Ligand binder design. Structure first.
Ligand SMILES: [Zn+2]
Ligand SMILES: [Zn+2]
Lengths: 52, 8
């Protein structure tokens, strides 16, 4: 029932959480943020890291 | 990073 990411779809596969505690979305699907492997260190979603 | 595998 709950949806996440920029696509606003349910949880599926591997998801990564934005390290900004105040991120409005928080969880994103790896594919939606062009990731294949768990990043090392802090990770911020496109919105929080300043992308358009 | 913080990641999780979808479960259930
Ligand atoms: Zn997505
Ligand atoms: Zn964020």
């Amino acid at each position: 029932e709950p949806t996440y990411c920029l696509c606003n779809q349910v949880s599926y596969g591997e998801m990564i959480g934005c390290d900004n505690e105040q991120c409005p979305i928080e969880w994103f699907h790896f594919s939606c943020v062009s990731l294949t492997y768990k990043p090392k260190g802090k990770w911020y979603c496109p919105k929080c890291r300043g992308d358009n | 990073a913080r990641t999780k595998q979808t479960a259930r």
